[PDB]
Enzyme design. Sequence first.
Site, PDB file in Angstrom:
ATOM      1  N   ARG A   1       0.876  -1.179   0.000  1.00  0.00           N
ATOM      2  CA  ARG A   1       0.000   0.000   0.000  1.00  0.00           C
ATOM      3  C   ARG A   1       0.903   1.215   0.000  1.00  0.00           C
ATOM      4  O   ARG A   1       0.635   2.173  -0.726  1.00  0.00           O
ATOM      5  CB  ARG A   1      -0.910   0.055   1.237  1.00  0.00           C
ATOM      6  CG  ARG A   1      -2.135  -0.933   1.194  1.00  0.00           C
ATOM      7  CD  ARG A   1      -2.953  -0.655   2.421  1.00  0.00           C
ATOM      8  NE  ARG A   1      -2.167  -1.001   3.567  1.00  0.00           N
ATOM      9  CZ  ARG A   1      -2.554  -0.907   4.834  1.00  0.00           C
ATOM     10  NH1 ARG A   1      -3.622  -0.208   5.155  1.00  0.00           N
ATOM     11  NH2 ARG A   1      -1.736  -1.297   5.795  1.00  0.00           N
TER      12      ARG A   1
ATOM     13  N   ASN B   1      -6.634  -2.288   2.155  1.00  0.00           N
ATOM     14  CA  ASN B   1      -6.743  -3.703   2.295  1.00  0.00           C
ATOM     15  C   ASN B   1      -8.201  -4.143   2.258  1.00  0.00           C
ATOM     16  O   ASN B   1      -9.041  -3.549   2.948  1.00  0.00           O
ATOM     17  CB  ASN B   1      -6.144  -4.164   3.627  1.00  0.00           C
ATOM     18  CG  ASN B   1      -4.652  -4.073   3.632  1.00  0.00           C
ATOM     19  OD1 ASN B   1      -4.053  -3.920   4.692  1.00  0.00           O
ATOM     20  ND2 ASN B   1      -4.050  -4.040   2.456  1.00  0.00           N
TER      21      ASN B   1
END
EC number: 3.6.1.7
Length: 90
Positions: A19, A37
């Site tokens: 990320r 997520n």
Amino acid sequence: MLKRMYARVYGLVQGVGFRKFVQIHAIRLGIKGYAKNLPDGSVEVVAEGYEEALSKLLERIKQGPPAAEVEKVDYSFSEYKGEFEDFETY
Ligand SMILES: [Cl-]
């Protein structure tokens, strides 16, 4: 021109710097949006920016950071909505 791109990323992509990787590459291209997520271990990326920049980001996303294993990226483009002031991770 400006678009939004949705990408869902599958593989080993949680817990592995993905990320943050997306974010850093999104910042370098001036792209805004987020990466998040999901409950199944997949990562959703919503990105807004010029199409060519979004295409470069998607080439990076297919690559991933060292600890990651990106197996599939399903992505689409759609209208730019101007919802984001930065690229965030969630
Ligand atoms: Cl770069």
